[PDB]
Design an enzyme around this catalytic site. Structure first.
Site, PDB file in Angstrom:
ATOM      1  N   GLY B  16       0.814  -1.202   0.000  1.00 23.93           N
ATOM      2  CA  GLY B  16       0.000   0.000   0.000  1.00 23.93           C
ATOM      3  C   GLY B  16       0.852   1.259   0.000  1.00 23.93           C
ATOM      4  O   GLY B  16       2.066   1.211  -0.209  1.00 23.93           O
ATOM      5  N   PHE B  89      -6.053  -8.538   7.161  1.00 21.02           N
ATOM      6  CA  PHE B  89      -5.432  -9.560   6.332  1.00 21.02           C
ATOM      7  C   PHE B  89      -4.145 -10.109   6.942  1.00 21.02           C
ATOM      8  O   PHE B  89      -3.590 -11.095   6.458  1.00 21.02           O
ATOM      9  CB  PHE B  89      -5.143  -8.993   4.947  1.00 21.02           C
ATOM     10  CG  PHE B  89      -6.320  -8.306   4.326  1.00 21.02           C
ATOM     11  CD1 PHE B  89      -6.333  -6.921   4.173  1.00 21.02           C
ATOM     12  CD2 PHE B  89      -7.438  -9.036   3.925  1.00 21.02           C
ATOM     13  CE1 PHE B  89      -7.445  -6.268   3.633  1.00 21.02           C
ATOM     14  CE2 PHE B  89      -8.558  -8.395   3.385  1.00 21.02           C
ATOM     15  CZ  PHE B  89      -8.561  -7.006   3.239  1.00 21.02           C
ATOM     16  N   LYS B 202      -6.489   6.937  17.187  1.00 22.36           N
ATOM     17  CA  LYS B 202      -6.392   8.177  16.424  1.00 22.36           C
ATOM     18  C   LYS B 202      -7.417   8.269  15.287  1.00 22.36           C
ATOM     19  O   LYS B 202      -8.006   9.326  15.065  1.00 22.36           O
ATOM     20  CB  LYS B 202      -4.984   8.352  15.843  1.00 22.36           C
ATOM     21  CG  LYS B 202      -4.714   7.481  14.628  1.00 22.36           C
ATOM     22  CD  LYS B 202      -3.390   7.794  13.960  1.00 22.36           C
ATOM     23  CE  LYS B 202      -3.310   7.062  12.632  1.00 22.36           C
ATOM     24  NZ  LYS B 202      -2.044   7.286  11.881  1.00 22.36           N
ATOM     25  N   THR B 259      -3.292  13.436  12.288  1.00 25.45           N
ATOM     26  CA  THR B 259      -4.479  12.758  11.786  1.00 25.45           C
ATOM     27  C   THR B 259      -5.777  13.537  11.937  1.00 25.45           C
ATOM     28  O   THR B 259      -6.660  13.429  11.089  1.00 25.45           O
ATOM     29  CB  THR B 259      -4.634  11.388  12.473  1.00 25.45           C
ATOM     30  OG1 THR B 259      -3.547  10.536  12.092  1.00 25.45           O
ATOM     31  CG2 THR B 259      -5.939  10.747  12.094  1.00 25.45           C
ATOM     32  N   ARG B 266     -10.089  10.594   4.779  1.00 26.22           N
ATOM     33  CA  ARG B 266     -11.394   9.961   4.709  1.00 26.22           C
ATOM     34  C   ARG B 266     -12.066  10.015   6.080  1.00 26.22           C
ATOM     35  O   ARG B 266     -13.283  10.160   6.176  1.00 26.22           O
ATOM     36  CB  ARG B 266     -11.254   8.513   4.232  1.00 26.22           C
ATOM     37  CG  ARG B 266     -12.569   7.864   3.851  1.00 26.22           C
ATOM     38  CD  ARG B 266     -12.401   6.373   3.591  1.00 26.22           C
ATOM     39  NE  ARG B 266     -11.516   6.091   2.462  1.00 26.22           N
ATOM     40  CZ  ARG B 266     -11.792   6.399   1.201  1.00 26.22           C
ATOM     41  NH1 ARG B 266     -12.935   7.003   0.893  1.00 26.22           N
ATOM     42  NH2 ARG B 266     -10.925   6.099   0.245  1.00 26.22           N
TER      43      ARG B 266
HETATM   44  N1  NAD Z   1      -1.712   5.647   4.518  1.00 26.51           N
HETATM   45  C1  NAD Z   1      -0.917   6.313   5.473  1.00 26.51           C
HETATM   46  O1  NAD Z   1      -0.508   7.493   5.351  1.00 26.51           O
HETATM   47  C2  NAD Z   1      -0.511   5.535   6.784  1.00 26.51           C
HETATM   48  C3  NAD Z   1       0.295   6.108   7.821  1.00 26.51           C
HETATM   49  C4  NAD Z   1       0.547   5.213   8.940  1.00 26.51           C
HETATM   50  C5  NAD Z   1       0.045   3.912   8.995  1.00 26.51           C
HETATM   51  N2  NAD Z   1      -0.717   3.482   7.930  1.00 26.51           N
HETATM   52  C6  NAD Z   1      -1.216   2.047   8.096  1.00 26.51           C
HETATM   53  O2  NAD Z   1      -0.973   1.377   6.897  1.00 26.51           O
HETATM   54  C7  NAD Z   1      -1.984   0.265   6.654  1.00 26.51           C
HETATM   55  C8  NAD Z   1      -2.662   0.584   5.374  1.00 26.51           C
HETATM   56  O3  NAD Z   1      -2.219   1.834   4.783  1.00 26.51           O
HETATM   57  P1  NAD Z   1      -1.719   1.949   3.288  1.00 26.51           P
HETATM   58  O4  NAD Z   1      -2.045   3.205   2.696  1.00 26.51           O
HETATM   59  O5  NAD Z   1      -0.305   1.463   3.284  1.00 26.51           O
HETATM   60  O6  NAD Z   1      -2.561   0.793   2.556  1.00 26.51           O
HETATM   61  P2  NAD Z   1      -3.596   0.642   1.398  1.00 26.51           P
HETATM   62  O7  NAD Z   1      -5.019   0.655   1.853  1.00 26.51           O
HETATM   63  O8  NAD Z   1      -3.129   1.533   0.239  1.00 26.51           O
HETATM   64  O9  NAD Z   1      -3.213  -0.879   1.171  1.00 26.51           O
HETATM   65  C9  NAD Z   1      -3.757  -1.818   0.207  1.00 26.51           C
HETATM   66  C10 NAD Z   1      -3.052  -3.063   0.503  1.00 26.51           C
HETATM   67  O10 NAD Z   1      -3.999  -4.082   0.940  1.00 26.51           O
HETATM   68  C11 NAD Z   1      -3.809  -5.190   0.167  1.00 26.51           C
HETATM   69  N3  NAD Z   1      -5.084  -5.790   0.046  1.00 26.51           N
HETATM   70  C12 NAD Z   1      -6.310  -5.284  -0.349  1.00 26.51           C
HETATM   71  N4  NAD Z   1      -7.293  -6.153  -0.342  1.00 26.51           N
HETATM   72  C13 NAD Z   1      -6.728  -7.339   0.079  1.00 26.51           C
HETATM   73  C14 NAD Z   1      -7.325  -8.724   0.297  1.00 26.51           C
HETATM   74  N5  NAD Z   1      -8.574  -9.058   0.105  1.00 26.51           N
HETATM   75  N6  NAD Z   1      -6.364  -9.686   0.754  1.00 26.51           N
HETATM   76  C15 NAD Z   1      -5.071  -9.464   0.987  1.00 26.51           C
HETATM   77  N7  NAD Z   1      -4.486  -8.175   0.787  1.00 26.51           N
HETATM   78  C16 NAD Z   1      -5.369  -7.127   0.329  1.00 26.51           C
HETATM   79  C17 NAD Z   1      -3.187  -4.767  -1.211  1.00 26.51           C
HETATM   80  O11 NAD Z   1      -2.691  -5.740  -2.050  1.00 26.51           O
HETATM   81  C18 NAD Z   1      -2.251  -3.744  -0.667  1.00 26.51           C
HETATM   82  O12 NAD Z   1      -0.995  -4.302  -0.123  1.00 26.51           O
HETATM   83  C19 NAD Z   1      -2.860   0.392   7.971  1.00 26.51           C
HETATM   84  O13 NAD Z   1      -2.307  -0.505   8.843  1.00 26.51           O
HETATM   85  C20 NAD Z   1      -2.703   1.876   8.381  1.00 26.51           C
HETATM   86  O14 NAD Z   1      -3.089   2.123   9.689  1.00 26.51           O
HETATM   87  C21 NAD Z   1      -1.040   4.254   6.773  1.00 26.51           C
END
Ligand code: NAD
Ligand code: NAD
Ligand code: MYS
Ligand code: MYS
Lengths: 346, 346
Positions: B16, B89, B202, B259, B266
């Protein structure tokens, strides 16, 4: 007690935005409310326009709010006195005009609420400490919290804290300042020192928040400045004898986050321009609280042997033409460290 | 030690935004960096476009970053493993594909960094705890702090904390994650629990920040929500055994302020719509972390007999069609109270 207290009269010395905003708050808890201003011709204008066109344009003053340049009339009968006069004019006020008012205050044991924020250059003392030189501590209380004047004046949900040595004194004031529609909520604390330190330092740090922006950094950077700068307020508080219970409360964390996220504030804009390289001389044009506060803050910190990394660099950039980028690097030259926060639970 | 550590390989399970953003960070400290993704056809696309068009559009990936859907290749040789797979997941990953990886991890004593944030519905456990069911605690560390993916990926100044039971373990990771240009700075802490609690709560509080906005409140209101909500993270942390040293650190105060000030997030937008009266059903359309987290957070809190005022009301508004205004009033029905913060200095 969770039941409010209404009064007949309340006086507010300080005709600026915050004082007026607080007059507005008081207009809803006090039968009568006078706001002391100095220029008589101006006092009239405002009363005529039913608006403080001087420091709070666009805000229609309640009818029970009256501006008067007569200290004697102003305080006469008040059951609560508020001081929102800029730090630099505070002492002069009491020497030149507090004569009778002080007498009245002591006489009737009227509760005083210090709303001014800053550090006096000559003494390096904070507001409530200065006023304390004329009025006994027991009567003194401090109001601090994230409270932008406009939002407070127009009744938009706001939370501040009331600090007093005697928590019961703070609570009484708490029942006087909290409004009936719960649009202005007060929380009691004893950390008067913490509140005052925070109220002053916040302005300096705000400039850094602006510096960070003009320097091209983003929101992550700001959240870090806010979190790191808070420890500086913590340490200075410890050095000055405060118990620090307000540091992470509304007076500290609260007001700090607010003041540093205010992109339109003079502190921010001044800092932003510095972050973009504009020399302090060039900028000027109406001084930012943070700028004024930076020098004495530095002198107080030094005198107390308290290290305030961010505040110090901000002082350099402002008063010693230091390159913001060099400052940032010097700041980060400390190397990898621990967060440096004690645990809360053993 | 204030001197960095560079590696040959580093694997990041989680394709992600944040995982990619962290791959970017790692690309500057690791000779090779593989990012594990599941869809093979997609893994190719990205590697072709030299950009994670899937979750981090607009950001050109460094050349030493390679996406692979082959867990085995992915982790092979890595000297540090990062987990940024969504909480829901996570467990499935280890049961279905962690077989060998776990073996390798234990075998070579590879340091693991948990970056995922949230609460698992079935167990009400946090990320590092879940992973802990497969990999020993000693190897586990948590990365938490105000770090918006985009700003981190594009190298904009960011500060986060690394939490580990053994502070030395945190510090090693600290020297691996901190970058040469000081654009990504890490701070060590032991409060793994606090960090995890904060990272999850948060999001819920962010929704409240949005609710406050759509409800017509301003910045004062937000600063108060941030300050009050922080105590909720504090109390839940205490209940879960955390030492709480991270609560007022980057993991808590930091990330929380970030945050909650993200007006485009969102969480905020969802909350704003709720604040404006739109029913949750109507909104939907891509779920907000805060929404998902609210239910289990509430169940965990209840189970632990921990009172989280703001979080609870936010849960009601979301899951029980409660009127935001009624919620706000119920919240304020508590009456006048003290700030409720212990002193820091005796
Ligand atoms: N986005 C940010 O700025 C930020 C900052 C800190 C922590 N986080 C943390 O990061 C995580 C997600 O953020 P992000 O933006 O990296 O992720 P995202 O939502 O962009 O991630 C999508 C991910 O989920 C996987 N995925 C989707 N559906 C799936 C399924 N059915 N089975 C298996 N894998 C599946 C994809 O292949 C991909 O690796 C959370 O734990 C969040 O709290 C995000
Ligand atoms: N503005 C805010 O939102 C806010 C919030 C919290 C605290 N405060 C505090 O309020 C104080 C000032 O804020 P403000 O907006 O109310 O004030 P302001 O700058 O609008 O106040 C002007 C005031 O200063 C007086 N004044 C100007 N020059 C003078 C002179 N030479 N001699 C004597 N009096 C003079 C005016 O008559 C008037 O009462 C500070 O202590 C500040 O830290 C402001
Ligand atoms: C004034 C310029 C921008 C500053 C942006 C934030 C820097 C945050 C971290 C400071 C760390 C201080 C460590 C100890 C000396
Ligand atoms: C979710 C709606 C907007 C909330 C705005 C902030 C309210 C802040 C103060 C909460 C006080 C809780 C006191 C104890 C029950």
């Amino acid at each position: 007690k969770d039941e409010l207290l209404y009064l007949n009269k309340a006086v507010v010395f300080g005709s600026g935005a915050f004082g007026t905003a607080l007059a507005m708050v008081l207009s809803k808890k006090c039968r009568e409310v006078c706001v002391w201003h100095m220029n008589e011709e101006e006092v009239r204008l405002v009363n005529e326009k039913r608006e403080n066109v001087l420091f709070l344009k666009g805000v229609q003053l309640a009818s029970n709010i009256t501006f008067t340049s007569d200290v004697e009339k102003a305080y006469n009968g008040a059951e609560i006195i508020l001081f929102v006069i800029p730090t630099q004019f505070l002492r002069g006020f009491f020497e030149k005009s507090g004569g009778n008012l002080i007498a009245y205050a002591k006489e009737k044991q009227v509760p005083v609420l210090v709303c001014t924020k800053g550090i006096e250059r000559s003494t390096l003392k904070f507001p409530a400490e200065i006023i304390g030189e004329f009025l006994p501590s027991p009567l003194l209380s401090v109001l601090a919290g994230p409270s932008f004047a406009i939002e407070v004046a127009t009744g938009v949900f706001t939370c501040v804290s009331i600090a007093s040595a005697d928590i019961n004194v703070a609570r009484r004031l708490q029942r006087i300042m909290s409004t009936g529609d719960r649009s202005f909520v007060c929380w009691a604390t004893t950390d008067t020192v913490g509140c005052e330190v925070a109220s002053a330092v916040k302005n300096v740090l705000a400039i850094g928040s602006g510096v960070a922006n003009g320097l091209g950094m983003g929101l992550n950077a700001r959240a870090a400045l806010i979190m790191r700068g808070l420890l500086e307020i913590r340490d200075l508080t410890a050095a000055l004898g405060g118990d620090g219970s307000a540091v992470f409360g509304l007076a500290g964390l609260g007001d700090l986050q607010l003041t540093c996220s205010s992109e339109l504030s003079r502190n921010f804009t001044v800092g932003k321009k510095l972050g973009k390289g504009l020399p302090i001389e060039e900028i000027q044009r109406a001084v930012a609280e943070g700028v004024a506060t930076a020098d004495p803050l530095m002198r107080l910190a030094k005198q107390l042997k308290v290290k305030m990394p961010l505040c110090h660099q901000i002082y350099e950039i402002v008063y010693k033409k230091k390159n913001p980028r060099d400052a940032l690097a010097d700041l980060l030259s400390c190397g990898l460290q621990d967060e440096g926060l004690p645990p809360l639970f053993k």
